[PDB]
Design an enzyme around this catalytic site. Structure first.
Site, PDB file in Angstrom:
ATOM      1  CE1 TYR A 187      93.605 -24.096 -36.794  1.00 44.75           C
ATOM      2  CE2 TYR A 187      93.165 -22.854 -34.778  1.00 44.75           C
ATOM      3  CZ  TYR A 187      93.087 -22.966 -36.154  1.00 44.75           C
ATOM      4  OH  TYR A 187      92.480 -21.957 -36.870  1.00 44.75           O
ATOM      5  CG  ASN A 241      95.467 -20.518 -38.471  1.00 45.83           C
ATOM      6  OD1 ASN A 241      94.803 -21.140 -39.296  1.00 45.83           O
ATOM      7  ND2 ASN A 241      94.966 -20.105 -37.306  1.00 45.83           N
ATOM      8  NE  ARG A 291      89.040 -24.980 -44.826  1.00 48.37           N
ATOM      9  CZ  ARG A 291      90.136 -25.100 -44.075  1.00 48.37           C
ATOM     10  NH1 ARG A 291      91.037 -26.041 -44.350  1.00 48.37           N
ATOM     11  NH2 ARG A 291      90.322 -24.285 -43.036  1.00 48.37           N
ATOM     12  CG  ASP A 331      87.934 -21.716 -44.368  1.00 50.64           C
ATOM     13  OD1 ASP A 331      87.656 -22.564 -45.242  1.00 50.64           O
ATOM     14  OD2 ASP A 331      88.374 -22.033 -43.244  1.00 50.64           O
ATOM     15  CG  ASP A 346      93.561 -24.569 -42.076  1.00 53.06           C
ATOM     16  OD1 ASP A 346      93.477 -25.726 -42.538  1.00 53.06           O
ATOM     17  OD2 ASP A 346      92.565 -23.996 -41.594  1.00 53.06           O
TER      18      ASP A 346
END
Lengths: 144, 145
Positions: free
Chosen positions: B49, B51, B95, B97, B128
């Site tokens: 994961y 960012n 998207r 958030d 992301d």
């Protein structure tokens, strides 16, 4: 530019397998030209370009002016595309752009995921998502 | 949050049409749980994961510690997914958030394009891409990059 641990051969740029994906790759190679006039030929009249979440450019004139402006203070030295893919009429590029500021000669590596929408082979939509913390410093224009 | 001008119904969240795409939308929904323990169950052991371009987390333990730390200082108040699609084993979400900083109560809308790689239905990679100019402010932790 190193290929990341997470890169997948299955989606590598060399494996592009649609007309849309092929055009977008070609558009990527053309970026190093720093030539707004050569680049705008890739866009439809009804189109848009945005570096999220900066004010977007809608219409081919605005897109041309925005590009011409960037290329006035900034050079695109290299584009490495790790992934290209597409779904539901959108093309996606996971990539790194090397950007060099003209007044300073400072270079920058931006990690970018971009989405493109093409109608009849021409760009109607282009949005690059990346961290703009240094893009502030890299582009000698107000981000506005 | 209004649908942007560029939203396409062809790639809308409601039109998700693969098991991978559907799992990712389920995962987006669960983000508002702000529960690292519930979120971690979506991930394979061999996972990551990140960012971008902050230091990545590799392996399930690092990913859980990372999420848990975020939820200590931020609530994910809403996730609106305008687009979801998939290609060559990757799933993409376009998207917004909505994040709220817990110590200040300030809110932030982040425009995000994210990529997900799933293996046997579990997340093996999640990245992301978005502007971090306000992520620094929003998130009351040192960013590490």
């Amino acid at each position: 530019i190193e290929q990341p641990r997470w890169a997948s051969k299955d989606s590598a740029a060399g494996a592009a397998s649609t007309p849309d994906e092929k055009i977008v790759l070609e558009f990527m190679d053309a970026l190093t030209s720093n030539d707004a006039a050569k680049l705008i030929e890739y866009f439809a009249e009804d189109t848009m370009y945005q570096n999220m979440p900066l004010p977007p450019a809608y219409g081919r004139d605005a897109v041309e002016q925005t590009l011409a402006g960037f290329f006035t203070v900034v050079s695109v030295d290299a584009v490495e595309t790790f992934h290209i893919g597409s779904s539901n009429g959108l093309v996606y590029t996971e990539r790194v752009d090397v950007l060099r500021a003209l007044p300073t000669g400072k270079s920058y590596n931006f990690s970018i995921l971009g989405v493109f929408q093409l109608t009849e082979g021409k760009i109607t939509g282009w949005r690059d998502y990346f961290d703009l913390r240094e893009f502030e410093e890299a582009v000698d224009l107000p981000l506005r």
